[PDB]
Every structure is written in C-alpha cells, then in structure tokens.
Amino acid sequence: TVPWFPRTIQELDRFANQILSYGAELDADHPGFKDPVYRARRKQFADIAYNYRHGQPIPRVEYMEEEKKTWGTVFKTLKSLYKTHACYEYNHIFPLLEKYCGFHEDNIPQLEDVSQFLQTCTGFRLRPVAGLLSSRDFLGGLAFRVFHCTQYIRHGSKPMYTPEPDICHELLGHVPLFSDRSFAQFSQEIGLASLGAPDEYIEKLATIYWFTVEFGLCKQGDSIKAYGAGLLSSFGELQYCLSEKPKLLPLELEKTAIQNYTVTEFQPLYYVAESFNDAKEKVRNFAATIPRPFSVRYDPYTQRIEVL
Ligand SMILES: [Fe+3]
C-alpha cells in the first residue's frame, strides 16, 4: 500500500494527533526538568499548538522577562558571527527582519508577524508545533510551503544550549532562509518527494534534510558559507564548520542520503551545495528514484496536491 499524506493545506491539521506526547522537557536530563514553572510554561505552548487550526492567526504570547533575557543573550552572541559566516541570502534579509519583524535583543518576535512576512516573500508560512512530529509529517508540510515551528524557548539556565529546537533556533536559524525564493523552492522539493514515499525513503529524505536545511554549507563567490539552520543558531558549530577541522564533501544525494550523523557533537563532515537551485534539481532527480505509484504536483492557486 501507500501511506496517507495530506492533499490540501488544511489537512495538515491532522498532524496534531500524531506527535510524541512526552516532551524532552520531561527528561531528567533536560535543563528545565526540575523547574515547575518551565514545565507549566511548556504545557501552555503545547496547548496553543494543539488547538491551532490552519487559517487562524497564530496566537500572540507575552514572554516573561526571564524568557526575553535568554533570547537576548542568544541573539547578541550569535549576531556577531553572521556578517562573516552566514550565506549572502541570510545577511540580505536579516535587516528586514529586524525592521518589520522586531528581531532585536529586547523582543522575542511573534510567530504570526514572522509568518506574515514569510508569506509576502515566498508564500511560506509557519504553524506552531506542539511536540515532535514524525519525519513523514514534518517533511510533508514543506510540500505546502508550511514550516512547523516551536514557539517556546529553551530553559534560561543554559542560554547557549538546547537539546531540542526552540524559538531561537527557528527564528535565527530557519526563518531567514525561508525568505529566499530559491531555498523555498528547494525545501518544497524535499517536501514533495516525501508525499506517499515508503518509510525507508522518508528516512533517506530526512537525512538529506539534515545535511542541507539543518547543517548545510554552500559555495558563495570563491568562498564557503553556512545556510544550515542548526549551524546558524549554534555559536560553537557556526565557527567550527568554517574552520580547517571539518571534512567537506560535495553535495551528492546518492551518498548524502545514506550518510550517518551525530546529534550531540559537532558534525565531523558537511556537504557543500553549489546553490539552492542546484540542490533543488538534485532533489528533483532523486525523488525520481523513489518507488511511488504516482507523481505529485502542488497547485499554489488552490493549495492542493495533484496526484498524477
Ligand atoms: Fe530545525
């Protein structure tokens, strides 16, 4: 058989019933495990995500001073590195995010505002996400240019550390790239490749995603820059990834897809993309090899997937 995949953008609403119900914040190892206020706060964000329905504005939340402080620390510390380490596309849009979205040390941007901004740039939109989505579900949303993103913030005890994605990672790592048409197209291609793909292929796609959207490096001029969300929101690794230490291989989906990675240490190797358009073409071809009984196409006019 073939696994269920949404056919219209509203159908993404079914994902809320298939997330991991036991958050990382319930783990004794989590920095905010013994913090009842944090736990309660996380539950509050989970409830907002859980009741969210497509088409509604994403609820605005008043962040606590403590939360603003953490955001402020992370923002200030990472910003110094962007002009020199981030890809051109990241740097070109950041000033605009600062202007229209309130990306500033004293203010955590509201997802609704950021969503509206992405929509006018590439038609990308955000949806608050409760817990951990399956790889299939997370990737599927990309087909509709929908990014599921966290609204909560990491525990304030370790501002430069997070065992999971949090709002700092989403806003400083993902968002800027989604403002670029080429990257948006590339991302969506990964999304389309997964609709109805068998589980073992979803895993290959998840691995390509990891080495591109999360930890990708790209050629720029005669230089190399970071575009991976995991690198752009990590002070340590962003500096490391462009040093002499890591091994850099050229993006080759045949191999990238089978590659193993760590999730607790810096990556021993990165794949470098020629451009986002090139990467998109590579995904397109690769998707051609996924044993799927049909072909999919997205109709931006009606926001529906067309099964051919
Ligand atoms: Fe991420």
How many whole angstroms from 151 Cα to the centroid of ligand 1? 13
How many whole angstroms from 106 Cα to the centroid of ligand 1? 23
Identify the domain containing residue 122 by its residue range: 1-308
Alpha carbon distances (Å) from 217 to 41, 60, 210, 267, 275 = 35, 33, 11, 12, 10
* 92 is known as an active-site residue: no
- Residues 238 and 224 sit within 8 Å (Cβ to Cβ): no
How many whole angstroms from 293 Cα to the centroid of ligand 1? 30
- Residues 238 and 78 sit within 8 Å (Cβ to Cβ): yes
Q: What is the CATH number of the domain that holds 140?
A: 1.10.800.10
Experimental method: X-ray
Parallel, antiparallel or unpaired: strands 296-299 and 217-220: unpaired
* 214 is known as an active-site residue: yes
Which tokens is 176 given?
């800027």
DSSP result, 281-303: HHHHHHHTTS--SS-EEEETTTT
* 157 is known as an active-site residue: no
* 30 is known as an active-site residue: no
Which tokens is 285 given?
């071809």
Please measure the distance between the N-terminal and C-terminal CA atoms of the chain and give it in whole angstroms: 17
How many whole angstroms from 271 Cα to the centroid of ligand 1? 17
- Residues 243 and 84 sit within 8 Å (Cβ to Cβ): no
Binding positions for Fe cation: 169, 174, 214
User: How many angstroms is the resolution?
Assistant: 2.0
**Spatial separation of the C-alpha atoms in residues 296 and 134, rounded to whole Å:** 20
Binding positions: 169, 174, 214
Number of separate domains in the chain: 1
